[PDB]
Design an enzyme around this catalytic site. Structure first.
Site, PDB file in Angstrom:
ATOM      1  N   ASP A  35       0.851  -1.202   0.000  1.00 54.26           N
ATOM      2  CA  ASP A  35       0.000   0.000   0.000  1.00 54.26           C
ATOM      3  C   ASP A  35       0.883   1.247   0.000  1.00 54.26           C
ATOM      4  O   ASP A  35       1.323   1.663   1.073  1.00 54.26           O
ATOM      5  CB  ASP A  35      -0.920  -0.016   1.214  1.00 54.26           C
ATOM      6  CG  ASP A  35      -1.840   1.186   1.246  1.00 54.26           C
ATOM      7  OD1 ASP A  35      -1.946   1.860   0.194  1.00 54.26           O
ATOM      8  OD2 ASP A  35      -2.451   1.396   2.312  1.00 54.26           O
ATOM      9  N   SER A 199      -0.301  15.535 -12.120  1.00 52.28           N
ATOM     10  CA  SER A 199      -0.507  15.169 -13.520  1.00 52.28           C
ATOM     11  C   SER A 199      -0.727  16.428 -14.348  1.00 52.28           C
ATOM     12  O   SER A 199      -1.297  17.402 -13.840  1.00 52.28           O
ATOM     13  CB  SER A 199      -1.679  14.210 -13.637  1.00 52.28           C
ATOM     14  OG  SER A 199      -2.023  13.956 -14.949  1.00 52.28           O
TER      15      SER A 199
END
Ligand SMILES: Cc1[nH]ncc1CNc1ccn(C)n1
Length: 330
Positions: A35, A199
């Site tokens: 994770d 992004s």
């Protein structure tokens, strides 16, 4: 040193991935959910409330000659999906794919929430976010990666998740055979303890690329891709009959649909998520309504590049003094 372990989807939908991890002496092998959105290595154990264990493999510290109680230390964690676990702490030897850390904090669950009990395939989590998020009190503990870092050939790990197929977690090296083209690196903020990056935009299907900054986290422990409501609405508007359902809890679409791809930007580079990756199948067994793999982050407070996005790429988690993320096509 290096390590290399295969990661395997737990089910036919790639809901999560499990990676075998050796704990203790002699080794006890548990299948852990790696994770990058959390920082605790916790396991089902001999201490876990018996009614909360349903088919998981347990760690039994009393059978490990290298286990030592970390006296006074407790932990308690709450995840974004409302699941939780808590317990006490041992140190022990932990190996992943041939890479060994001595003195790793192994957080032994006394209590787990129903979602963990109900998933017989996941024996615990191995956190790979920054150690500043580790929940152990009163002495915060380091992640497996942070403990291994100084020993590694290069202070990196890579996630190469498969679509309906096994993939690989590597520690300490970048397998130049595992990706196509070049790796594009992008800046990371550690201010929230995550692999947080920006992004450069997106495209839907064969549509034009929209240049827009989308701050989010690279999170292997989240199944889906959670993005701003504007972006998600633009995606699902291209699927006939798709809608947001408050009763189901997100966008659904006709199972008869062919989904468009979704592209996200990494600097000047582009990662393309094929349409099929966005299909999470019937909402209930036999339904013709299918659950979407791109969902709004509006109710979360952060955008999450979860497995749907990450499995489309070879992803480098660069833990150098100034961390960075790398993405390549594959
Ligand atoms: C495994 C995990 N990570 N974070 C929370 C949880 C527990 N709940 C879920 C929800 C889907 N799955 C497979 N497990």
């Amino acid at each position: 040193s290096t390590g290399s372990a295969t990661t395997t989807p737990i089910d036919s939908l790639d809901d999560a991935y499990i990676t075998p991890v050796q704990i203790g002496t002699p080794a006890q092998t548990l299948n852990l959910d790696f994770d990058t959105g959390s920082s605790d290595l916790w396991v089902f154990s001999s201490e876990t409330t018996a009614s909360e264990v349903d088919g998981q493999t347990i760690y039994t510290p009393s059978k490990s000659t290298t286990a030592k109680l970390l006296s006074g230390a407790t932990w308690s964690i709450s995840y974004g999906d409302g699941s939780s676990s808590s317990g006490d702490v041992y140190t022990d030897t932990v190996s992943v794919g041939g890479l060994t850390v001595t003195g790793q904090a192994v957080e032994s669950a006394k209590k787990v929430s129903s979602s963990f009990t109900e998933d017989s395939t996941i024996d615990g989590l191995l956190g790979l976010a920054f150690s500043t998020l580790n929940t152990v009190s009163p002495t915060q503990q380091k992640t497996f990666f942070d403990n291994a870092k100084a020993s590694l050939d290069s202070p990196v790990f890579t996630a190469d998740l498969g679509y309906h197929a096994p993939g690989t977690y590597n520690f300490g090296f970048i397998d130049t055979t595992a990706y196509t083209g070049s790796i594009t690196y992008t800046a990371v903020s550690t201010k929230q303890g995550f692999w947080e990056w920006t992004s450069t935009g997106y495209a839907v299907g064969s549509g034009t690329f929209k240049s827009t900054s989308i701050d989010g986290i690279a999170d292997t422990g989240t199944t889906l891709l959670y993005l701003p409501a504007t972006v998600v609405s633009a995606y699902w508007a291209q699927v006939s009959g798709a809608k947001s359902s408050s009763s189901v809890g997100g966008y659904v679409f006709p199972c008869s649909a062919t989904l468009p791809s979704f592209t996200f930007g990494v600097g000047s580079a582009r990662i393309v998520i094929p349409g099929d990756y966005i299909d999470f199948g019937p909402i209930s067994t036999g339904s013709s309504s299918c659950f979407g793999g791109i969902q709004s982050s509006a109710g979360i407070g952060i955008n999450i590049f979860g497995d749907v996005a990450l499995k489309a790429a070879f992803v480098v988690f660069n833990g150098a003094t100034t961390p960075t993320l790398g993405f390549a096509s594959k």
